[PDB]
Each structure stands twice: as C-alpha cells, then as structure tokens.
Design a protein around this ligand. Structure first.
Ligand SMILES: Cc1cc2c(cc1C)N1[C@H](O)C[C@H](c3ccccc3)[C@]13C(=O)NC(=O)N=C3N2C[C@H](O)[C@H](O)[C@H](O)COP(=O)(O)OP(=O)(O)OC[C@H]1O[C@@H](n2cnc3c(N)ncnc32)[C@H](O)[C@@H]1O
Lengths: 665, 134
C-alpha cells in the first residue's frame, strides 16, 4: 500500500473505515454524515504519513496543520483532536525522537513501572512525554528484560529475542529508523542433517515438509469441521490432534492394503471356479472321445442308429471343445489380471522411521516458534493471531537487539537491582515495596498515583508468589494467569576462532533420533559478524536441558557439528553461553502461548486494569490504580517484541487519559 | 469443508480411534492381523490353483477331431432324413445341433424339414418325447 493508505496499513488501521477506538473518541463523527467520516479518515491517515516519513523528529500540531492542503486544513479543531488522539495512543510521536517542544519542568501525577523490558520502557517514554513523573523498578542489573544480548569483544549474540517479523505494519520499522539497528534478511534455505551426519536429499526434504503442512491443515479441519475440540472433558491439544491424524493416515494405508488383497483373493477365487469347471469339462471330453472312438470302430456299412451315434458324438465333442476354448480364453484374462495386481501394490507405510524423524524436526521447529511442546497448545486457538501477521521477510539484529532497550532507556529514571516484593493499591494511591537484589535487607518504599505492572506471566504464575499484591488480585485476573500458558526455549552461543560452516547458509538443522529429543539442539543459526554458531533447544527438551551442565551441553553441540563438518574441522570453542529462561527468577520462561483450555480472551483479561475498593464505606467508585502491560497482555500480537512495545503504548495512553484527562473526547 | 487432497478423516474413524487410551493401537493391530489373514489365504489358493493347472497339462489336444467340411446338398437322402429324426429326438429344437449332426444341411433346411415332414415323421410325438427327458 502507498500514499495515505500505506500510512494506515503501517499503523495497523483500515484506511477506509473508523476503528472502535476512534469511534469512542469521536462519537460525533462516526454517527454523523458519511462525508465527515471521510474528512476524519484523511486527516488521520495524512498525519500518520507525516510522522512515518520522518520518525526522528516530533510531529507537532502546528507542523501538521502547516502541511495540510485545503479544505482539510480549515477545521483547525478537528485536526487538533485527531493529532492529540494519535499522540495519546502512541500512533505518532513514540520511541526515540528529537523533541521540538522541550519537556515542561512541572510534572503531573506519579507513576511507578515494574520492569524495564520493552513494554515497560515504551510506556515510560510515553508517560514522561505526556508530562508525568515516572520511575522504573528493575530487578536485573540491566534493561531489556527478555531482550538480552551477549557481548564480549566482537562477539555479539542474542540470548533472548532475535528476530524482527516483517516490516509491513510492524512498529519496529519506526524504531529501526530511530535506533542504529543493523537489520539483515534471513535466507530461508535450511539444509537438514540426520543423526549420522549425512544430509537430507531435496526429494525427502520437500516431501516431508509438504506432509507437515498437510498434517497441520488436517488438524484445522478436525477442529472447525468435525468439532473435535473436547475429549474426555479435557480440551484437545495440537499434539493430540496431530497424533490422531497420523494414526488415521496409518489406518488408511492399511484399509488400502487390505482392499488390494481382497481384490486378489476375489479374482483368485474366480480362477478356482473356472479351473474346476475346466478340469471337469476335460474329464467329460476325455470320456466322449473314448465313446466316439469306440463308435467309430464299428466299420461301415452300418445301420442308421450306429451312424447317428459317432456323428451325434462328433457334434457333442465339437460343442464341448468350443466351451473349453472359451473357458481357457477366460483363464488367460484372469491370469494376467492377477499379474497386474501383484505388480501394482499400494503404499507399504505412511511414513518410514527415517520419514518420521524428519517430520519430528518440523514439529520441533513448531515447538520452537510457540516455545512449548505441541501437547500444551490449544487446538482451537493456537493460531488465533495469524490474521495479524506483518508482510515482508523476517530480519535479524546484526548488532544485537539490546540496542533497542538501551536506546529507549535514555533519559529515564531506572532503578536497577531493585526487586519489587509487594504492590499495595488503595482508593487514595499506591505504594510499592522493593528490595536491593545485592543486599535483600535494604528496603525501598515508592508512593504513587498508579502502578504499571509489566512482570512476565511466568513471574505472575509463581507459587509461592514472588510478588504479593495487596489486596490480592481478583479471581477473574488470577484464573486467567493460571489458564494462560508460559513456554520455554533456550539458546546455546558457540564462539569460535574460524568459520568451518557454509557461509552462504544462515541456518541448518539436526534431525534427532527419537521423538522425545526432537527439540534438542535441532537448529543452528549463522547470522552474526564474528564466527558464532547459535544452537536452539525447544519443546520438552528445553525444560530438561536446564538441569544439564554447560560442559555437557557444549559437548553435545560439538558432537553434532563434528558428525556434519568432520571430526577435525570443529575446534574447541573460545566462549560459550547457555540460557536458562525457566530457572531465571525474573522470567520463569521464554514467552506465553495459547494453552489448551485458554483462548485469546485471557489476553484481554490480562490487560484489564484493577480498581481498588473504597477506603471509606459509601465513598464514590474509585479510580483504576493497577495497570498491566507486557507481551502476555496483547491478544493480537502476543509472544513478541512488537506486542510488548504496543502493550506499553496502550497502557501509557490509558493511564494518561485517566490521570491527565482527555481534551480530544 | 474438505480434508487436504489425499488425507483421510471422518467422524466415524475419529470416534473409533479416540474411544479409549488404547483404541488407536487396537484398531491398527486388528488391521495388521487381518492383512496376514488374507496374505496366507492367497498363498493357500495359489497352491490350490497351481495343482489344478497341472491337471490341465496337455489341454484337450489329444481329444481334438478334424473338421469334415462337405458340400451342402439341397436334396434329402433317406439316410439324411433318418439322421434328422434321431437328432430331433435327442436335441429337440436346437436346429444348429441337428444341422451339425447331418453335415450337409443348413439351419433353414432343418426348419423346413420340421414343417414338410411334420405328419409323416411324427415330429409332434418326437418333440414331446424330448420334453419328457430334456
Ligand atoms: C526469552 C525469549 C524471548 C523471545 C525469543 C527468545 C527468547 C529466548 N525469541 C525467539 O527467537 C522466537 C521469538 C519469536 C520469533 C518470531 C516471531 C515471534 C516470536 C523471539 C524473537 O526472536 N522475536 C520476538 O519478537 N520475540 C521473541 N521473544 C519474546 C520477546 O523477547 C518478549 O515477548 C518481549 O521482549 C518481552 O517484553 P516484556 O517487557 O513484556 O517482558 P520483559 O522484557 O520480560 O520485561 C519484564 C521485566 O520485569 C523484570 N522483573 C521481573 N521480576 C521483577 C521484580 N520482582 N521486580 C522488578 N522487576 C522485575 C524483568 O527483569 C524484566 O526486565
């Protein structure tokens, strides 16, 4: 999309229609005449275009009205209302940009943000930009949370987020223009290597992948058309569905083998009946021939009765001889019909042991993307966010993703090594109790008007809780937390002194021997400047490998590589790093997934702010005080960096609207 | 509203495999056993047919008679008429058989005999005689 329509697409908005959010802020416009709506849409789209064309500088109201042509620039208030709406909702003026109108020294409202990850940082920049007093409390000795980049000398490798998913519609496209992001396209060519170390030929690679996609498509049919979503009172998982489909394919291979034999036996029995008929006919022919011979012995001249015989027997023998020839003619047809069937058997198996192993790699790859075993994914909803995918090719941050959060941290009040312990929210305000991670006895008290909680879902799931809420969170909030899934996936950074792998190849795979260990170091990445190889641990393997020491993990990595490139081609690594996201107290996993028994609605529930009860009985309904942002709080874009980023922008707007008022409504 | 082209899924098959924790294995095992049951049944009949083929070795060659092709004569000799009468008694209405027994009379000439010598050769009696024994 180009022009103003491109601007709407880049902002995830329909160009020819007003959204529900816009309807709420502009009820007078959406309910009014169609013409006015078109005037609103144009102003909105153009203002977006202006900001997108140059996201390195603040787009002010005056600068917007200046670049608008008649008649749209006549209604100054409508332009101001649209501009403020976009600014407040972070559709324009978000991230890192040069401020034309310096931040006013006088602040309004106090906000404490828990966590300095992407979602927390995005919201902080916005809240500060709106004129609020903002302080961030981070438990780690760094920012970025799940955006962690390993840096040593020239070695740069991401241990957390690493992939940007398409730029079309991605808020990360703007960020990449504000930050020195060295984005590089990901070459999708991925060669596979079996346990023995030998490559998988193109024929098999394509045949198995096609089958993998066919199997996924089948589970969808099984869910939408056959309504197989609940079995034994339990929600059906993606793994269960896939297992069923595979079993049914094995069944068909067998209902076809049986049918093909059964056709052979039917024809085989037709031959039996025909042969029996032929044998008995040969007997009668033998008998008649002897009778004819005996009758022929009666030498002429002879009476007509003797003459009737012989001639009468000749005719009977000739007639029976015709019958045998026609029966022998049928014997030749059936005989070759059996030779055709015996030469044309159906498929022996659905998938061989070798085929199943390669298929397991594809399932492991899916377990990597979802950061969870397929048996935990909700069949009905695992792909609920597929319709919101960005257009374009996936990229990688060549200079480490951490450049984003580090850049977004500039000018912000961030308290590192500060672990929040308790969150207190009342009708008059909030107080957050936190301690020093280096010396737990040292306690800190933070008073504020509102609290923005960006704790990972894994942390919120902790039992016993790491962070206590007072009063406790309502059942509707905790039940969502328990239903939602929080997966895991790990990475092994292997730093070498030379390149022994294929440089033109961005990534290659390792096919495991068993289904159980399918996700164990199944994929190796080659995306950085320095000779670095990154191994991935997915599925059931992720959780188990965390209890295995680094040395043993690195050993397995080398063993796999030695079997592929040669035992002498792989030297001992100079540097190695192993991530353990599940054991990490500030994460307790990698990212959220749609678990069986959950749905996209839980994400909405996670986003809902908490409003405390009144302090005094009979006092008016209080203000919402506790807010939530984070990857696990954005239904359309969860388990991503852009989603986190967007969730922060959402809360910043909601908080400002509540504590600063919305003049544009 | 359709499974992938080549994939097979049906409400009946899904229910049968997911009936219990061992239904999947049970279904596949019962099909595996039914395959062996039919495979051994094939070799059994293959052996039976092979033995029947040996009993047909040589075919019907030593029992084959040469064809005595003779000129089709229009006139009926006393001997030919008597051959017909006995043919009608043995074959009934199979004009083709009767004609083949005589050798030099066409199918139409046989039918004409049935009407021409109907009374004189008691064909009515001869025909009912054949019906009593087929
Ligand atoms: C861990 C991890 C994550 C990813 C990835 C890999 C790993 C190993 N990758 C994988 O390669 C695949 C996955 C992906 C690829 C393609 C499409 C979609 C997804 C990806 C990736 O590259 N690309 C991506 O966009 N997101 C990923 N992600 C997910 C994103 O990184 C996250 O969704 C996002 O960065 C999370 O942002 P957030 O702000 O919502 O959460 P945190 O960044 O954890 O912030 C929470 C903060 O609270 C702090 N905290 C915890 N307890 C505290 C406490 N008690 N007191 C104070 N602070 C506390 C934590 O230290 C942390 O700083």
């Amino acid at each position: 999309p180009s022009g103003v329509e491109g601007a709407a697409f880049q902002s995830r908005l329909p160009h020819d229609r007003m959204t529900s959010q816009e309807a709420a802020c502009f009820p007078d416009i959406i309910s009014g005449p169609q013409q006015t709506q078109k005037v609103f849409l144009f102003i909105r789209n153009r203002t977006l275009q202006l900001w997108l064309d140059n996201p390195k500088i603040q787009l002010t109201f005056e600068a917007t009205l200046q670049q608008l042509e008649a008649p749209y620039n006549s209604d100054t208030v409508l332009v101001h209302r649209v501009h403020s709406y976009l600014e407040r909702h972070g559709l324009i003026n978000f991230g890192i940009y040069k401020r034309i109108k310096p931040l006013p020294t006088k602040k309004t409202g106090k906000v404490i943000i828990i966590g300095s990850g992407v979602s927390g940082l995005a919201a902080a920049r916005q809240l500060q930009s709106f004129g609020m007093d903002v302080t961030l409390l981070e438990a780690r000795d760094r920012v970025g949370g799940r955006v962690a980049t390993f840096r040593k000398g020239n070695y740069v490798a991401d241990l957390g987020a690493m992939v940007v998913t398409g730029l079309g519609g991605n808020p990360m496209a703007v960020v990449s223009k504000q930050v020195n992001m060295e984005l590089a396209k990901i070459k999708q060519k991925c060669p596979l290597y079996e346990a023995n170390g030998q490559a998988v030929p193109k024929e098999k690679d394509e045949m198995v992948e096609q089958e993998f996609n066919r199997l996924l498509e089948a589970t969808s049919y099984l869910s939408h058309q056959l309504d197989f979503n609940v079995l034994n009172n339990k929600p059906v998982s993606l793994g269960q569905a896939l297992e069923v489909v595979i079993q049914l394919q094995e069944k068909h291979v067998k209902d076809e083998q049986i049918e093909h034999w059964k056709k052979i036996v039917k024809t085989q029995e037709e031959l039996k009946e025909l042969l029996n008929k032929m044998v008995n006919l040969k007997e009668k022919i033998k008998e008649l021939h002897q009778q004819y011979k005996e009758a022929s012995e009666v030498k002429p001249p002879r009476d007509i009765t003797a003459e009737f015989l012989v001639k009468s027997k000749h005719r009977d023998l000739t007639a029976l001889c015709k019958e045998y020839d026609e029966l022998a003619e049928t014997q030749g047809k059936l005989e070759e019909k059996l030779q055709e069937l015996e030469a044309n058997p159906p498929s022996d198996v659905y998938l061989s042991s070798r085929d199943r192993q390669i298929l397991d790699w594809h399932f492991a790859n899916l377990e990597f993307a979802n950061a969870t075993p397929l048996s935990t994914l909700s069949l009905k909803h695992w792909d609920q966010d597929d319709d919101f995918e960005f257009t374009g090719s996936h990229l990688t941050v060549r200079n480490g993703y951490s450049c984003v959060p580090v850049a977004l941290a500039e000018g912000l009040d961030i308290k590192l090594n500060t672990a929040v312990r308790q969150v207190r929210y009342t009708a008059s305000g909030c107080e957050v109790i936190a301690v020093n991670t280096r010396s737990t006895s040292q306690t800190f008290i933070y008073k504020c008007d509102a609290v923005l909680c960006t704790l990972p879902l894994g942390v919120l799931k902790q039992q016993p809780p790491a962070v206590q809420f007072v009063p406790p969170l309502p059942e509707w909030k905790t039940s969502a937390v328990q239903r939602m899934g929080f997966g895991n996936l790990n990475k092994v950074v292997l730093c070498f002194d030379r390149v022994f792998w294929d440089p033109s190849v961005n990534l290659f795979g390792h096919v495991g021997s068993t289904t159980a260990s399918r996700g164990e170091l199944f994929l190796f990445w080659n995306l950085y400047k320095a000779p670095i190889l990154l191994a991935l641990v997915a599925g059931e393997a992720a959780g188990i490998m965390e209890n295995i020491s680094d040395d043993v993990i690195v050993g397995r990595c080398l063993a796999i590589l030695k079997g592929i490139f040669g035992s002498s081609a792989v030297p001992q690594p100079k540097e190695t790093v192993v991530s353990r996201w599940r054991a990490d107290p500030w994460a307790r996993g990698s990212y959220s997934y749609v678990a069986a028994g959950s749905s996209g609605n839980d994400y909405d529930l996670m986003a809902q702010p908490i409003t405390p009860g009144p302090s005094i009985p009979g006092a008016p309904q209080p203000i919402p005080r506790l807010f939530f942002a984070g990857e696990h709080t954005i239904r359309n874009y969860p388990a991503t960096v852009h989603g986190a980023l967007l969730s922060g922008l959402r809360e910043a707007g909601r908080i400002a609207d509540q504590f600063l008022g919305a003049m544009y409504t | 509203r359709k499974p992938p082209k080549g994939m097979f899924l049906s409400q009946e098959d899904v229910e049968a495999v997911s009936a219990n924790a061992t239904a999947a294995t049970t279904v596949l095992r019962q099909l595996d056993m039914e395959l062996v049951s039919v495979k051994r049944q094939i070799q059994n009949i293959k052996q039976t047919n092979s033995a029947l083929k040996e009993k047909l070795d040589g075919g019907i060659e030593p029992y084959r008679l040469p064809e005595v092709i003779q000129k089709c004569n229009a006139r009926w000799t006393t001997e030919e008429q008597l051959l017909a009468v006995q043919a009608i008694r043995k074959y009934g209405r199979d004009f083709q058989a009767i004609s083949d027994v005589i050798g030099n009379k066409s199918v139409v000439q046989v039918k004409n005999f049935f009407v021409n010598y109907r009374r004189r050769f008691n064909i009515d009696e001869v025909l009912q005689e054949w019906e009593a024994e087929h």
